[PDB]
Design an enzyme around this catalytic site. Sequence first.
Site, PDB file in Angstrom:
ATOM      1  N   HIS A  41       0.799  -0.947  -0.243  1.00 42.20           N
ATOM      2  CA  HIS A  41       0.761  -0.136  -0.246  1.00 42.20           C
ATOM      3  C   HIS A  41       0.542   1.242   0.073  1.00 42.20           C
ATOM      4  O   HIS A  41       0.401   3.029  -0.055  1.00 42.20           O
ATOM      5  CB  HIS A  41      -1.026  -0.101   1.067  1.00 42.20           C
ATOM      6  CG  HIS A  41      -1.037  -0.053   2.406  1.00 42.20           C
ATOM      7  ND1 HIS A  41      -0.881  -0.764   3.823  1.00 42.20           N
ATOM      8  CD2 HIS A  41       0.352   1.369   2.585  1.00 42.20           C
ATOM      9  CE1 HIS A  41       0.021  -0.311   4.090  1.00 42.20           C
ATOM     10  NE2 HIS A  41       0.022   0.781   4.165  1.00 42.20           N
ATOM     11  N   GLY A 146       2.425   5.812  10.842  1.00 42.56           N
ATOM     12  CA  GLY A 146       2.664   5.900   9.654  1.00 42.56           C
ATOM     13  C   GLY A 146       3.935   4.036  10.630  1.00 42.56           C
ATOM     14  O   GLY A 146       4.846   4.160  10.346  1.00 42.56           O
ATOM     15  N   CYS A 148       3.021   0.859   9.603  1.00 43.84           N
ATOM     16  CA  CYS A 148       3.322   0.276   9.292  1.00 43.84           C
ATOM     17  C   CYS A 148       4.068  -0.378   8.152  1.00 43.84           C
ATOM     18  O   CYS A 148       5.574   0.923   8.052  1.00 43.84           O
ATOM     19  CB  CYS A 148       2.237   0.432   7.205  1.00 43.84           C
ATOM     20  SG  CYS A 148       0.982   0.030   7.845  1.00 43.84           S
TER      21      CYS A 148
HETATM   22  C1  LIG Z   1       0.185   2.134   8.299  1.00 45.38           C
HETATM   23  C2  LIG Z   1       0.121   3.028   7.316  1.00 45.38           C
HETATM   24  C3  LIG Z   1       1.067   3.188   7.098  1.00 45.38           C
HETATM   25  O1  LIG Z   1       2.365   3.428   8.186  1.00 45.38           O
HETATM   26  O2  LIG Z   1       1.241   4.899   6.428  1.00 45.38           O
HETATM   27  C4  LIG Z   1       2.291   5.796   6.005  1.00 45.38           C
HETATM   28  C5  LIG Z   1       2.579   5.726   4.502  1.00 45.38           C
HETATM   29  C6  LIG Z   1      -1.348   2.298   8.677  1.00 45.38           C
HETATM   30  C7  LIG Z   1      -1.596   1.395   9.979  1.00 45.38           C
HETATM   31  C8  LIG Z   1      -2.799   1.416  11.680  1.00 45.38           C
HETATM   32  C9  LIG Z   1      -2.672   3.261  11.393  1.00 45.38           C
HETATM   33  C10 LIG Z   1      -3.857   3.488  12.668  1.00 45.38           C
HETATM   34  N1  LIG Z   1      -3.461   2.365  13.158  1.00 45.38           N
HETATM   35  C11 LIG Z   1      -2.980   1.201  12.777  1.00 45.38           C
HETATM   36  O3  LIG Z   1      -2.709  -0.084  13.120  1.00 45.38           O
HETATM   37  N2  LIG Z   1      -2.001   2.087   8.550  1.00 45.38           N
HETATM   38  C12 LIG Z   1      -3.002   2.263   8.130  1.00 45.38           C
HETATM   39  O4  LIG Z   1      -3.518   3.278   8.177  1.00 45.38           O
HETATM   40  C13 LIG Z   1      -3.821   1.804   6.843  1.00 45.38           C
HETATM   41  C14 LIG Z   1      -3.477   2.029   4.985  1.00 45.38           C
HETATM   42  C15 LIG Z   1      -4.370   0.814   3.646  1.00 45.38           C
HETATM   43  C16 LIG Z   1      -4.757  -0.013   4.212  1.00 45.38           C
HETATM   44  C17 LIG Z   1      -5.204  -0.518   2.571  1.00 45.38           C
HETATM   45  C18 LIG Z   1      -5.121   0.055   1.692  1.00 45.38           C
HETATM   46  C19 LIG Z   1      -4.481   0.922   1.847  1.00 45.38           C
HETATM   47  C20 LIG Z   1      -4.199   1.641   2.630  1.00 45.38           C
HETATM   48  N3  LIG Z   1      -5.385   1.354   6.705  1.00 45.38           N
HETATM   49  C21 LIG Z   1      -5.953   0.721   8.183  1.00 45.38           C
HETATM   50  O5  LIG Z   1      -5.401   1.157   8.787  1.00 45.38           O
HETATM   51  C22 LIG Z   1      -6.943   1.708   7.639  1.00 45.38           C
HETATM   52  C23 LIG Z   1      -7.908   2.703   9.056  1.00 45.38           C
HETATM   53  O6  LIG Z   1      -9.332   2.799   9.690  1.00 45.38           O
HETATM   54  C24 LIG Z   1      -9.131   2.601  10.691  1.00 45.38           C
HETATM   55  C25 LIG Z   1     -10.746   3.766  10.619  1.00 45.38           C
HETATM   56  C26 LIG Z   1      -9.631   1.627  11.320  1.00 45.38           C
HETATM   57  C27 LIG Z   1      -8.675   3.140  12.099  1.00 45.38           C
HETATM   58  N4  LIG Z   1      -7.962   0.535   7.804  1.00 45.38           N
HETATM   59  C28 LIG Z   1      -9.288  -0.290   7.232  1.00 45.38           C
HETATM   60  O7  LIG Z   1      -9.973   0.790   6.470  1.00 45.38           O
HETATM   61  O8  LIG Z   1     -10.350  -0.948   7.808  1.00 45.38           O
HETATM   62  C29 LIG Z   1     -10.718  -1.550   6.912  1.00 45.38           C
HETATM   63  C30 LIG Z   1     -11.316  -2.924   7.404  1.00 45.38           C
HETATM   64  C31 LIG Z   1     -11.432  -4.186   7.228  1.00 45.38           C
HETATM   65  C32 LIG Z   1     -11.794  -4.908   8.512  1.00 45.38           C
HETATM   66  C33 LIG Z   1     -12.120  -4.568   9.686  1.00 45.38           C
HETATM   67  C34 LIG Z   1     -12.667  -3.389  10.131  1.00 45.38           C
HETATM   68  C35 LIG Z   1     -12.317  -2.189   8.731  1.00 45.38           C
END
Ligand SMILES: *[C@@H](CC(=O)OCC)[C@H](C[C@@H]1CCNC1=O)NC(=O)[C@H](Cc1ccccc1)NC(=O)[C@H](COC(C)(C)C)NC(=O)OCc1ccccc1
Lengths: 302, 306
Positions: A41, A146, A148
Amino acid sequence: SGLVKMSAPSGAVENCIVQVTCGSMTLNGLWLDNTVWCPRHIMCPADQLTDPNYDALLISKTNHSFIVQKHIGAQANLRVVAHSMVGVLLKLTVDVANPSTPAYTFSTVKPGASFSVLACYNGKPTGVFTVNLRHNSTIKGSFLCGSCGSVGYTENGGVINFVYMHQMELSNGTHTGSSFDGVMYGAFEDKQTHQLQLTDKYCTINVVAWLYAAVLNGCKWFVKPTRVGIVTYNEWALSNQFTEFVGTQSIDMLAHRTGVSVEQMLAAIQSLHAGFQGKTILGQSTLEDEFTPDDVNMQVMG
Amino acid sequence: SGLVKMSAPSGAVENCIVQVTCGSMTLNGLWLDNTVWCPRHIMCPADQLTDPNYDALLISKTNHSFIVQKHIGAQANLRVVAHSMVGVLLKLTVDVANPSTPAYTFSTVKPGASFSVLACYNGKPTGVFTVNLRHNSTIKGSFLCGSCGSVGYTENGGVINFVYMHQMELSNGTHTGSSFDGVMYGAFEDKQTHQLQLTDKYCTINVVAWLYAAVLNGCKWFVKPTRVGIVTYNEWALSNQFTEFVGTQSIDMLAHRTGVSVEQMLAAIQSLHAGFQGKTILGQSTLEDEFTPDDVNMQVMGVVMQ
Ligand SMILES: *[C@@H](CC(=O)OCC)[C@H](C[C@@H]1CCNC1=O)NC(=O)[C@H](Cc1ccccc1)NC(=O)[C@H](COC(C)(C)C)NC(=O)OCc1ccccc1
Ligand code: NI
Ligand code: NI
């Protein structure tokens, strides 16, 4: 004596953390030999995370689209010479082999297993903690934006076992990632679309290990002559959101050491699940299911 | 989101762990610049631990009585060129400076402060965990025989603060050690005799920080309009084994972020201490007092509109 959440020392993993940048997206990577692994991603623009077309995104990239930087220790920019996509990971090839690559293996942990996490931000390690893969194949960690590319691992006999790369937050305090074959734990898709998490369960074998640690730490009020057979417990477990108990050498060692049978511990679980009734076990009033039998054995003897 | 017990990455400390041997006794040591620190009980024969005469033991030793070795990572066999006793530690001067000495300082933590522990056995780091210095100046760790010389530390702004060197177990799951000035936390003596530990207390400010982390993680059922003033709460705390609440910027940041006052959190403590009424806070049915306000801010604080 004493029982705490213990992680494996992180130094060998810290030496492998790098920062990976693709466009305006920056996250952590793991550098082993001439390979850098990071979540795929990183290729997504920030406003197109709902349902990315990773095949289309991959074809638009060249080796020059990825910048890799070692931020801790001897700082260096690593040149990307190749790239491919493995499940939900990017497998980048850099022109320099990591000189601090530890002896290592890649494994996929099963539900009920524990592992250490090196939380990283901007290719910089910031914290270490231990998690357990839940029955629904999620972890209950602590991660912010940040994080990931943060790495989950275990260590034994001088070998680092790399088991997890952080990918996403599913709901409050609930997280998932992939093993290094690019397979997401719990089969969650790396897209920001609602996906249902399966129901979680108390990991019986870990609760049993914890009650043995409690006995070995002088807390034994819950031990009675009352016994419940494994098959009877397993039938009750299927109806009370507990996992099936399957015997192991590690539990037998604790049973032999304390002189308390597995069947007495299963009867204690059924009693304690109904309520602790104003009493504690190792300062807790709820059952703890994130210490495995091996984690407990580690803290009682060698 | 989420809240877990987090330790500082241990790699910079792992690079400083050595094994020290004096006669038939072997334990862990910390190598920084040209100095190696280890517990002074390494000078005791295994059958004379009840009440050692450390002054008499020290005079019987020369520089050659100590063997320092580094097994893990960049290996080494060091030569001791001077030795002295600093409180409950031996301070050995070696002929080689540790080339991986991190930027560091020595500090003594106060009760209610948290720190990371690198548990070691025979000079090998084996585990990392976090503890809090209890009100009675003990820690609730996990240590077995051969763990003395394990190191407690914190990290901030690129500096390792070395705060603890493990020495002994006082009672089940209760431990102590010394700061690097050789002063034992809680003034316990390094002898195998019964010594009384003072009564412990719940660290109020850490419980308040935890209830703010709970609110920031969507758990706020315990928040009511009910308030308890600091002065009133501190009088109640003196009688209920809770520490005095003293305001801090870190708590004010959490109070400003959540819009829940400190006085509402102090009312919630008094209510929750009487009982949780069958409900849970962050999966717990007892108050957690080992996360400091800074530990919580690290895991829950984000961007702030001004
Ligand atoms: C790490 C991303 C990173 O480092 O970004 C800099 C480039 C980050 C870690 C999470 C954020 C808060 N705590 C974390 O562990 N990851 C992300 O933000 C994900 C990025 C991404 C994933 C897939 C495609 C494109 C981008 N997204 C999520 O974690 C996202 C967060 O949403 C909330 C609203 C839950 C905080 N999760 C999401 O959309 O999950 C969908 C879902 C799936 C299953 C059950 C429920 C919901
Ligand atoms: Ni022993
Ligand atoms: Ni010792």
